[PDB]
Each structure stands twice: as C-alpha cells, then as structure tokens.
Amino acid sequence: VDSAVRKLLLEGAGQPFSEENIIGIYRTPLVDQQGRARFNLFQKELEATKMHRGNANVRYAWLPCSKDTMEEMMMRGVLEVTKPVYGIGTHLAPANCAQTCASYSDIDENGIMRMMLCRVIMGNVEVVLPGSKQFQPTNERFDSGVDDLQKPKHYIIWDANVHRHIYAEYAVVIKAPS
C-alpha cells in the first residue's frame, strides 16, 4: 500500500512530520544492475526463511541514508549502508520510529535528511548488548538482532544477510523541521 509511507511518517508516532517537510517519496528500482527483479528475490528469500524458521518475521524499518548511498540505490539498485552502538552491522529503526531514525541520521548542508523504508527479513531475533562487537548470529538458531525483545528501538542485520534480507522499497527525503 502506497499510503503506508505517509502513514508511518505523518501520524505514526508521538512526534509527527508535516507534508512541507517531505521533499520526496520515491519507489526504488525494480531491478538491480544484473537485471534481477529485486522484489522477486526478496520474496524468494522470504520463502526460504519461512521454511527454515517457521516464520520470516518481515518488518518495516527505516534505514538512515546519505546522499551517496541513496544515489547508489536510485541510480543502480545497489544497497550501500552508512555508518546504533549495538554490534557491527546495519542498524535500522522500527517502522514507528522515523523520528528516532531522523534524530539519529545526519543533516546535510541544505538541511535535508534521507532514509529508506525497507522490508527486512529478521527471522529469529536475539538481544545485542550496547557497545557489542558482535558481527554474526550467536549460533545457528538466530538470524538478526534487537536491542530489546519487548520494546525494540533498533534492528540489526548482520553483514552476511544485508544483501538478502533488506529490501529497500521507498526513498524518503525530508527537510529538517522549520
């Protein structure tokens, strides 16, 4: 559903955003450089995790972006991550924490923030400690990390899974407020 982006952005959490703050919302490319349909690949990965774990645990999440990394996606279908003290991996904010991902993302010279709404295959999650140097699942039973099992504020995707479990779906460009 197209409305889900503004749904999460404007009315989602306690802190809202305004339409004037949204510079752009854009779909990501359908194929990567090598012509593979990106959504179909993600569906394939979704089915594989579902069959292995019993549930794929697909979430919406916000990926902090720089100008360059958004360009890699929007020009070439390539996923690049910018450098969240919870392990060595890709850190994402839960769907309702766009303001948190906003407060934890960079603001450039033109007063602009960038982020991407992704569907993420999390699979089985475990706790990652703050300041942890973890870079992979603890053991074969887990796939991804959270900072808190009851009240997650951060999702963590390990390097080995970034190219198969993160599907960037919308690019979002926001003007710093007022």
Asked whether 61 and 72 are in contact (CB, 8 A), the reply is no
Asked whether 17 and 10 are in contact (CB, 8 A), the reply is yes
Distance CA 46, CA 172 (A): 24
Quote the Cα angle for 74-76-81, to 5°.
70
Asked whether 94 and 114 are in contact (CB, 8 A), the reply is no
Single-letter amino acid, residue 25: I
Single-letter amino acid, residue 170: Y
Every domain of the chain and the residues it spans? 1-178
Asked whether 154 and 93 are in contact (CB, 8 A), the reply is yes
In the chain, what's the furthest Cα-to-Cα distance? 48
Resolution in A: 2.1
